[PDB]
Amino acid sequence: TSCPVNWVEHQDSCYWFSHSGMSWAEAEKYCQLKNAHLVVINSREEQNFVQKYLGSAYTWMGLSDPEGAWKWVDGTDYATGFQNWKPGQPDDWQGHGLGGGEDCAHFHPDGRWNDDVCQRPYHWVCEAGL
Ligand SMILES: CC(=O)N[C@@H]1[C@@H](O)[C@@H](O)[C@@H](CO)O[C@@H]1O
Ligand SMILES: [Ca+2]
Ligand SMILES: [Ca+2]
Ligand SMILES: [Ca+2]
Ligand SMILES: [Ca+2]
Ligand SMILES: [Cl-]
Ligand SMILES: [Cl-]
Ligand SMILES: [Cl-]
Ligand SMILES: [Cl-]
Ligand SMILES: [Cl-]
């Protein structure tokens, strides 16, 4: 085993899928505590692997835009990288009325992405090197 117990190995990364929900900031903290990061989707092949094993619930990834531009937590370039947005997303929606727009990306159960309110308790995926 190249990955720790409770982690899944795929193509030179280890992944951990939560069975619980946290805000994006608390999930980011959790992953960093484990010497990992919220998942960064680098390719269609990795998107297919992650979406196949989602827990049938909205799930945070390591993609956010609170200071204006979309950034991956590990510095992977967003604009030249893989994208898989739901139709009409991202929309920085304000109409939830919770304050501000929407600055954190998550998967829908089908794998397509949405921007949502960072404070929402969603599932998350951690990713580390082998
Ligand atoms: C979970 C989900 O996709 N939520 C979105 C939300 O982020 C916003 O984009 C809204 C605009 O009408 O459409 C949906 O409710
Ligand atoms: Ca992180
Ligand atoms: Ca990755
Ligand atoms: Ca935004
Ligand atoms: Ca949205
Ligand atoms: Cl958990
Ligand atoms: Cl897209
Ligand atoms: Cl709006
Ligand atoms: Cl937000
Ligand atoms: Cl909520």
UniProtKB/Swiss-Prot annotation:
The gene is CLEC10A. This is C-type lectin domain family 10 member A. It comes from the Eukaryota. Ca(2+) 2 binds at V40, N42, E46, E127. It is found in: Cell membrane; Early endosome membrane; Lysosome membrane. C-type lectin receptor involved in recognition of N-acetylgalactosamine (GalNAc)-terminated glycans by myeloid antigen presenting cells (APCs). Binds in a Ca(2+)-dependent manner to alpha- and beta-linked GalNAc residues on glycoprotein and glycolipid antigens, including alphaGalNAc- and Galbeta1->3GalNAc-O-Ser/Thr also known as Tn and T antigens, LacdiNAc epitope GalNAcbeta1->4GlcNAc and its derivative GalNAcbeta1->4-(Fucalpha1->3)GlcNAc, O-linked core 5 and 6 glycans, and GM2 and GD2 gangliosides. Acts as a signaling receptor at the interface of APC-T cell interactions. Disulfide bonds join C3-C14, C31-C126, C104-C118. Interacts with A-, B- and C-domain containing PTPRC/CD45 isoforms: isoform 1/CD45ABC, isoform 3/CD45AB, isoform 5/CD45BC and isoform 7/CD45B. Does not interact with PTPRC/CD45 isoform 2/CD45RO, a memory T cell marker. Ca(2+) 1 binds at D91, E102, N114, D115. Expressed in myeloid antigen presenting cells in lymph nodes and skin (at protein level). Expressed in dermal dendritic cells (at protein level). A glycoprotein binds at Q89, D91, E102, H108, N114. Ca(2+) 3 binds at D65, D92, E102, D103. Residues 10-127 form the C-type lectin domain. The chain holds residues 181 to 308 of 316 of the full protein.
